[PDB]
């Protein structure tokens, strides 16, 4: 499908959740990236679409304190800035 290669920070985030590799389809990236968030309970408990990452590598990565998963163009863009291919 869309085979991407994650940048250094993102690859580290990925390994953190078991993804042991250098090349991924867009789907694997999102899957693990979602597993990281769910696992480290980084979402707001009441408004689950709010994710907090100020205190997190995810924030270093996306370069923002928090974000709304409901803003597809934003999420997709931030994620793309960290990929190649």
């Amino acid at each position: 499908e869309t085979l991407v290669r994650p940048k250094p920070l993102l690859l580290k985030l990925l390994k953190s959740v078991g993804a042991q590799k250098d090349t991924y389809t867009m789907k694997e990236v999102l899957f693990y990236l979602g597993q990281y968030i769910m696992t480290k309970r980084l979402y707001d408990e009441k408004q689950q679409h709010i994710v907090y990452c100020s205190n997190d590598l995810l924030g270093d990565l996306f370069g923002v304190p928090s974000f709304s998963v409901k803003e597809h163009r934003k999420i997709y863009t931030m994620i793309y800035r960290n990929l190649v291919v």
Binding site: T2, L30, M38, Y43, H49, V51, K70, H72, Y76
Partner: peptide, 13 residues
Amino acid sequence: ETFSDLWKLLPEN
């Protein structure tokens, strides 16, 4: 609306 529901609606490619 839970996180997992929301997150799966992201562009998969």
